[PDB]
Structures are given as structure tokens and as C-alpha cells.
Design a protein around this ligand. Structure first.
Ligand SMILES: Cc1ccc(CCCO)c(NCc2ccc3nc(NCCCN4CCOCC4)n(Cc4nc(C)ccc4O)c3c2)c1
Ligand SMILES: Cc1ccc(CCCO)c(NCc2ccc3nc(NCCCN4CCOCC4)n(Cc4nc(C)ccc4O)c3c2)c1
Ligand SMILES: Cc1ccc(CCCO)c(NCc2ccc3nc(NCCCN4CCOCC4)n(Cc4nc(C)ccc4O)c3c2)c1
Lengths: 49, 35, 49, 35, 49, 35
């Protein structure tokens, strides 16, 4: 039975790891968009202001 | 929303957050089955 | 003893999972605020500039 | 700070980051007790 | 053998935990930069606009 | 890029994301060695 339990935990941690990858990918996209906003302000807004 | 590619990228971030939460749900469900 | 160990690991992973939920919720709020900034620039700043 | 609801939301993000780190601390402490 | 397995899982979860700390630190820096952008817009852009 | 300290901080976020992914890789590799 116990190896069954150990196996459930391995599977669970594999799923947790996929969660962290997914979140990391979302933060990477968000980071790109924050940099885009900063560049838009400096290179589109400020020159016409 | 979404009005453009910036908004579409924001939507993608939200989809990745929801994927994260889904994978945690699955992990939690596997653990609540452990004794 | 070993089932005790297995149990500590289950508890640990449950705590790690709560960490990832908490961080995901923080990233969701941050994402909303980045979208708010973008809309403020386009709909408050640019029209008066 | 916080001067408004935008700043208050930023504070909330920081609170969620601190909650995350706290839950990791607890997980780490449980594991350093495993042999 | 099985305690060996349990040990691999403990090590794995310790690594997953370091992943979540790293990502949390990146989100903290990003959060600071979003607040900086908001303050730049309100205190540098808007007063000259 | 990086043109200033704001861009350098953005680079730091990217380095922390890559560190996160690296630690997950290591965890995954340890688990694929479990039976
Ligand atoms: C010189 C330079 C440097 C950096 C950038 C940003 C990244 C590339 O777009 C640009 N973008 C030019 C550029 C030129 C025309 C653009 N048009 C859009 N979106 C369509 C219009 C959206 N509508 C929605 C309703 O309210 C008014 C604005 N964007 C998307 C957009 N993107 C950002 C980041 C902020 C605001 C924003 O509307 C543009 C970006 C230019
Ligand atoms: C048409 C349109 C579209 C989108 C938005 C943003 C989201 C809703 O607020 C708005 N906001 C109007 C709108 C109108 C008055 C506002 N007043 C505030 N904050 C109070 C003033 C803060 N002080 C602090 C000290 O330095 C000067 C600014 N905010 C909060 C705020 N929020 C953001 C996102 C950026 C900067 C900012 O000061 C406003 C937003 C309007
Ligand atoms: C009153 C007040 C309140 C808040 C801030 C933002 C945080 C502190 O810098 C400021 N910053 C003043 C301030 C004054 C001069 C600055 N010069 C820079 N960067 C160097 C120029 C970068 N180049 C790259 C190419 O395209 C044109 C812009 N930054 C970095 C920077 N930082 C941000 C956040 C947005 C855009 C931006 O270029 C400045 C910030 C001032």
C-alpha cells in the first residue's frame, strides 16, 4: 500500500511542478508587457508631450 | 477587451495563472487521497 | 517511523501548494494593475496630450 | 504610499508574495525534519 | 530501496521550494517596477502634460 | 536594452524566472528517477 502512497506524492509533485512552470511563463509574458509599457511611455508619449 | 495585442498578452497571463491553479488543484486532490 | 516521514512530506507539499496559490493570486492582482496602467495611459494621458 | 487604490493593490501583491514565502518556510521546516 | 525513493522526493520538493522562492523574488522586483512606472506617469509625465 | 536601472531590474526578473525554471528542471529530473 505504502509504495502506492509514495507514488501519489510523486504524481502530486509532478503536477505542482507544472503549476510553477505555468506561473513562470505567465510572469515572463507580464514582464515583457511592463517593459513594453515603459518603452511606449518614453518613446511614444514623451516625444509628443 | 481584448482591444489589441497588449490586451491579448494580458489574457494569456490570466490563462497561465488559471493553468497554474488547475495543476495545484490536481496536486491537492492526489494528496487528499494519501494516507 | 517511515510512514511518519511520508506524512511530513505530504504536509510539506500541501504547504508548497498553498505558496503557489498565494503567488498566483498576487500575480493576478499585479496583472490587473498593469492593464489599468495601460488603459490610464491610453484613455487619460494621451487624450489630454 | 499607499496614496490610492492602485497603491493599495500593489500592497496586496506584496502581502501575497510574503504569504507565499511563509508557506515555503513552513514546507522547508517540515522537510528539514525528515530522515 | 524505498527510503532511497522517499529521499529523492524530499530532495525534489526542496528544489521545487527554491523555484517558488526564486519566482516570488522576481514578482517582488516586477511589482516594484510597476509601482515606479505608475509614479513616473503621475509625477513626471502628467505635470509636464 | 538594458538602457537604465529600470531595464536592469527587468533583466533581473527574467534571471529569477530562469532560476525558477532551473530548480523545477532539477526537481523533475529527481522524480523521473523515482520508482
Ligand atoms: C516607439 C514605440 C515603442 C514601444 C511601443 C510599445 C510596444 C509595441 O507596440 C510602441 N507602440 C506603438 C503603438 C502604436 C499604436 C497602437 N495601437 C495600439 N492599440 C490599439 C488601440 C487600443 N485602444 C483601446 C481603446 O482605448 C484607446 C486605445 N497599441 C497597443 C498599445 N501598446 C502598449 C504597450 C501601450 C498602449 C497601447 O495601445 C499601439 C502601440 C511604440
Ligand atoms: C479613463 C480611465 C481609464 C483607466 C483608468 C485606470 C483605472 C481606474 O482608475 C482611469 N483612472 C482615472 C483616475 C482618476 C483620478 C485618479 N486619482 C488617482 N489617485 C489619487 C492621486 C495619487 N497621487 C499620489 C501622489 O502623486 C500624484 C498622484 N488615481 C489612481 C491611479 N490609477 C492608475 C491606474 C494610474 C495612476 C493613478 O493615479 C486616479 C485614476 C481612467
Ligand atoms: C518624480 C519621479 C517619480 C518616479 C520616478 C520613477 C522611479 C525613479 O526613477 C521618476 N523617475 C525620473 C527619471 C528621470 C530620468 C530618467 N532617465 C531614465 N532612463 C534613461 C533614458 C532611457 N532611454 C532609453 C531609450 O529611449 C529613451 C529613454 N529613467 C528611467 C525610467 N524609469 C521609469 C520608471 C520609467 C521610464 C524611465 O526612462 C529616468 C527616470 C521620477
Amino acid at each position: 500500500h505504502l509504495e502506492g502512497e509514495v507514488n501519489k506524492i510523486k504524481s502530486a509533485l509532478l503536477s505542482t511542478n507544472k503549476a510553477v512552470v505555468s506561473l513562470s511563463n505567465g510572469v515572463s509574458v507580464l514582464t515583457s508587457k511592463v517593459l513594453d509599457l515603459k518603452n511606449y511611455i518614453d518613446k511614444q508619449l514623451l516625444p509628443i508631450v | 477587451f481584448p482591444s489589441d495585442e497588449f490586451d491579448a498578452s494580458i489574457s494569456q497571463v490570466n490563462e497561465k495563472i488559471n493553468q497554474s491553479l488547475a495543476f495545484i488543484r490536481k496536486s491537492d486532490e492526489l494528496l487528499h487521497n494519501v494516507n
